[model samples]
Target chain A: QDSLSFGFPTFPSDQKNLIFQGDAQIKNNAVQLTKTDSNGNPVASTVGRILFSAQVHLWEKSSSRVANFQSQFSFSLKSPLSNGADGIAFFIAPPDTTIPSGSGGGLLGLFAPNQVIAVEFDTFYSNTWDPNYPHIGIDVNSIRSVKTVKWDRRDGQSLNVLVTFNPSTRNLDVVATYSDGTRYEVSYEVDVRSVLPEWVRVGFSAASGEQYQTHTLESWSFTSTLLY
Target chain B: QDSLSFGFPTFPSDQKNLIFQGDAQIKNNAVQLTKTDSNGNPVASTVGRILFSAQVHLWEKSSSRVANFQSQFSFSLKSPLSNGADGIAFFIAPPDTTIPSGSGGGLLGLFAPGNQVIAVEFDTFYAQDSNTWDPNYPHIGIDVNSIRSVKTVKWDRRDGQSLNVLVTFNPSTRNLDVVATYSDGTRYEVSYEVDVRSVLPEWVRVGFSAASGEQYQTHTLESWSFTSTLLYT
Candidate 1:
């Protein structure tokens, strides 16, 4: 009856205040965080640059929960006509800082300080930014992540992600489904409470330097409970 | 990243605002809400109607994730000598009505109108407000949108003894289950299939409520813990 939860199918909200700053817009009812032009705007250059965006907010930040919480969203980051630059990142930042304007390039747009944690999807490969191929990495405080896994475009559709944080066992687990009907899971045992500030904000960030693309969010949902 | 959970194991907090009103207090850090005797003082009433209580806020009235929650507590109620009149109820109400005034006989101190969302009640006497088929003179009951319970079951307890209890709800199944483990290694469980959404609001206030009616008694909550989460896909 009072549980906090919402699915985009019902257009739960207009989501006008979900963003703190950046180039986010509405598309098909879902949010389109980053977009580049085709008709008037010229093709993206080859040098590193950035135009970041976000969609989402901190559902509950004043107080925390004692149980489990989950969030899921759908996103597509393809130029459709050609290949694109960099990628987007799902991030959690403190109430203090959001989109820190750090160095661009393969760094994407997630250049917040140590207080920010990001799970970035790197689309282009750069020796300085990626180990090799396009990958997904869990970041803590910087664009330079500690660990990363291989990922790629599977000629098909949008991708979906689900993040579940269970405090009882101190684990943050993430799973995703891709275009070719493939799924992957990433799990870690770090106590999220210790790393996360007592109060915070959560959202998304993206960057497309000289190479740009269109990033549209199809749908999303977030739910959690509180105890004292 | 923030989930509100309270388990006695981790003293995450002595609970800064964990309140104490009426006769409730934090004992051994395990919220002791009611008592008949306190340091030689006769806290129990000799005759008049009483609404002794203790309540603490959990979350916001709206945009909160605590609606579907789980509760774990150890408590016991005793007359000390005479059988008691009213009983205790675990409730969910609107923030505007954290403490509702009611009767001493059967209402269980939850009769105030409008905001008395839902209460998981305990029965201890025979009164017009109570069911005639109540398992025994005393039982456990479930109430929704009112002080009167939708169902009840007989109950018994030893003097100066406490039982570990757990109450949980599932939205997908629309079920409310209460499990009790007595001090003597006995366990009992009761469940009800209900659509809680129909009778409750989008946001709610929750805590424990009790009374000292015609027959006075001592009800104590030894420990309490709660956890809530959202299921999104």
Candidate 2:
């Protein structure tokens, strides 16, 4: 049983009153957090990081709200042996927050036609990316892939990922390990560090959209080592 | 607008958690507690009093427990215009309490057969002899009088009611208004004291049961007051 860990900064306020509302049920010795609109959907704030660890399983009927915009987030694991073990997603949306999309069905519950991003772990065929699944690519403003084969899901077995924006480099890094124990790194040196408004809250969300069945959270963790 | 007041006894373990559990909603500044059983029949317990300095309309209802073998408890005001309004009732079964005969229709819900004392009211119906519905005869017990008659309803209109009781009473002065009132007025009378355990935590299931239609209509109270006390004589 592989474990997951996350660390983050604490705000200087009354922490006890901070309510963590959600449905956390125990199933198969695993604490599974189901993504549903009626359940505990995180309130919008400009601070803090949410982290967890888990085995990922993808289905098309799932969807979630990262902020206010409707978006579908999913991932493809490296192997069936580890049972879709390692992947990471940054649930991001437009700055102005709104209630979740209530309509049901689809990859991640009918994401509003607006700017969105899905930093996914590709394992299945994405039509937008020329019919190739099992790859690591960025899906921008669309549920399907806009870029493909930037990273291969099967090649990167048990990959360790550190997705952080370096203020000095003004860039974001996506790094992983292949089954041959080789290291592959891709750096998107866009000034997202400056483009993202100050004091924005970040968390996790997954959706099946119209193509898959259900998406599961394996484990996620976050550490705010750098201050904005 | 009318107002009602009540006071409770002060004791170390004196606590009352009034639970209005069900699908009843609040309307017109009043909360109505109501429910229906699996058989579409209604069960209810309206045990409390409401007061008014001026004359006002009054309505109330009481029903037996859904299960045949359990006891039911309820109380209501004598009338809106009267002062010192006091009345109470305890629907008991002889360790083997059963529902009345027929579909248990009329004013009292499911209080037929006349075997069980269906309705026990105070302040108006008085006759050393317990007639089914006797006005002026205070503290009367009916084996099967469910609806409010011009006589019994007015009987309840005159005398004041203070609290409700459960144990068996001495029938000699039992139905007499002055006797029942004086007995309850004394600081040492044990019958007037409320015993939560005797009536609550009912070993049987508890919920609201009722029925309604044309001839035998149902009336309801907008609000009520419940109190408990101790005698230190």
Candidate 3:
């Protein structure tokens, strides 16, 4: 019941505990979760992800307990075309989750048969499931967001994001701060035990379409506490 | 060498370190810096402030060194009238600084002659200052001892919107930056360069002040956190 903690201030050349798939790779001390063309532009019609090699214990069935988790990350998105397409997500998925084909663009590369829990920093606004403006969304098992708040997008600005979940309150909160220090916060209440399994893989995912952007992760740290 | 830090998630009634003046008071776990009449309407033509009781180390005349400071605060303005009047400010002034008389409205309560004062103003009214006029009706500005701003940026004003604002000053570059975010998720920013040592003394007092004009509005501070790193040469 102590805690599980890990941090990556800068991605190293050899990441023993990280699994990169699709177009994701570590470049320039950071994790590039999407492929960039020779001109440094995000490649269209692509999906990428980097996950922890090991699954985290998320909930206990016998003890009826859930883990409280928190993660902080620094990331940036650069859109050469001025309009950013798709976006990125911090997701918790089934232990054997892998990048699925045909999930590029607005899917953010985490789409599956109802098996993903994610907080998305979405830039593209698909009218069917997205608000009229750019937004931060909480997604459970679907591309449609259950809750969302407008996100002020400043092209190429590095953002610091904080995601926290409290088992007792079952409240998942996301806060994002721009390099200029402006902050935005959004929270949603959901019982993970009902939708998620006892163990899960946690990581970052991104996708690109006709209008693409380079998604870069500069740093990440996470901690989780489970009661016996 | 060391740093100074203080924070208030919410104001309490027994705030011994905070000095309240004019219409300022602790109410509902927040600092209400402007008065509201019995009908819950902002009292017209009013000014109020809450200052730290002790002086803070700002600069060193002997060492020719300055301090880097940062402050974050959560605040909201409620206007009974459709059009909000005046606004608020975070300021640094001389140790003996107090609420100045006749400094209500667009002045934001920090206006004095060529006094040692520096302020970041959140103004709502578009008032004229002789030949120069205030920026668009809701704007942010950097003030150096005068109501007329040295730099200004338009602000998006929403009724009863809770805003989180961060202000930072780097002494080496003499650049001060302000970033404000609304609960709706919109963000705006402004920056200017001014040597604080040219406007404030070695030791200064830091505080928040607000005011209301004929067009009224209620201003409250929900929380505040500040830090200062004094550099030695």
Candidate 4:
């Protein structure tokens, strides 16, 4: 099975695939999905500007059935921009290169081939976005989403999340815990092979609208294995 | 009403009473209870030589009728002089400037006036090897009315560089359990039963006291965390 593990300070050289469109970079051993530009300055009111990064080495189904997998990570979102607008997402995009370099804002950054499934963290409320706003969701091929809930942010506190998927049941379990000891869990059902390729890339995507904010991926661990 | 909390690298100054006769000094926030002068020196063959430090503030409230409480700590007693000789203990004794002197070798520093209470001893000697004290080797035992253990289990004294110990008592259950973890990645647990409301004073003092008799051994505390707060009704 394919796997990915990163413990800050720097990325490893043996990447199977590297995909990024906008300001996706690594700093202080952490991945900066979106926040500043190459100049480290917050961008002016922007939209549809997708900033995505993914690992595609596991994109082969035969060697890796892409069945059951688990992913856990620590993250921090700081410096909210006006009523907290826009957001980020952790997703499994279909095959070779699915992140559209031009997507951002509410698009949460995925484009054509359309078969990408993502868990989006939307900040601002829009009839088009999660009504609860600043909530997490199980999004389908479209940013329209399938299920969502309020994203608990304890004053820009450090938080962690774990997502485990079992293909035998098409069940995805998600657990989120904040630094203060508060926790939340959610589950979703989706057939990975149907909306995505047998082989797919996994990564994070984020964007901003007229509002701005910062999202940092502190650390991540992923494991993929076949069930007995 | 009394509490004592300390960590390595730093020690707290607010104390009710600091009582110790000899060889008990605070260094790097940890207390060193054995001979620090020379190593491998022959320990004077004595009977009651002791090193004891007690905090009475919390003990006062506890003794006055303390209910439930918990204590945790980490210590190191490296290079034993011998497993079948001498010993150490965590005990509850009456308060005062009393640092009794006279014996060493065996009595573990505690003399009459204070040795008449309850204690949890990590006895190194068998008091009779294959005979007395449960016919066990090194062991951990519980004491109720006096220095004599009421229950025990032969146990090895060495645990990593430091041993982590957690002691909890629930008056409701009239039970006390002691759990210790060694550096080698292993854990040991033992427990005892007693009615503190009747056996102990309405308020008492709590502290860590140990001694090396003739078979002197090092007793160094790397850290101490004891919260003597009332936990039960």
- Highest DockQ: which candidate? 1
Looking at candidate 4, what is the lDDT of residue A36? Answer: 69
**Model 3 CAPRI rating:** incorrect
* Model 3 quality (TM-score): 0.49
> What are the Cα lDDT values of the candidates?
0.54, 0.29, 0.78, 0.56
DockQ of 3: 0.01
Task: Report the number of the highest-TM-score candidate.
Answer: 1
Per-residue lDDT over B149-180 for candidate 3, one digit per residue giving the tens place of the 0 to 100 score: 67777787787788899999999888899999
lDDT tens digits, residues B9-33, model 1?
Answer: 3212234324344555454434444
Clashes of each: 14, 55, 0, 25
Please identify model 4 stretches exceeding 4 Å from their true place.
A1-18, A37-41, A45-66, A111-113, A126-132, B1-233
TM-score (chain A) of candidate 2? 0.48
Please give, as one word, the docking class of candidate 2.
incorrect
For residue A133, what is the lDDT in candidate 2? 35
> Residue-wise lDDT of candidate 2 within B1-233, one digit each (tens)?
01111211211111121222222223223322222234322233322211211111010111121111111133233222323222233332222333333322222333443332233333331334434444343333322223322123223332222333232322222321112222245321122222222332222111222222222111222223221111111
Query: Model 2 off-target regions past 4 Å?
Result: A1-88, A93-110, A113-118, A126-128, A139-159, A178-184, A193-195, A209-216, A225-228, B1-233
True contacts kept of each: 0.00, 0.00, 0.00, 0.00
What is the i-RMS of every prediction? 13.0, 27.0, 18.0, 25.1
Candidate 1 yields a Cα-based lDDT of 0.54
Instruction: Score candidate 2 by DockQ.
Output: 0.01
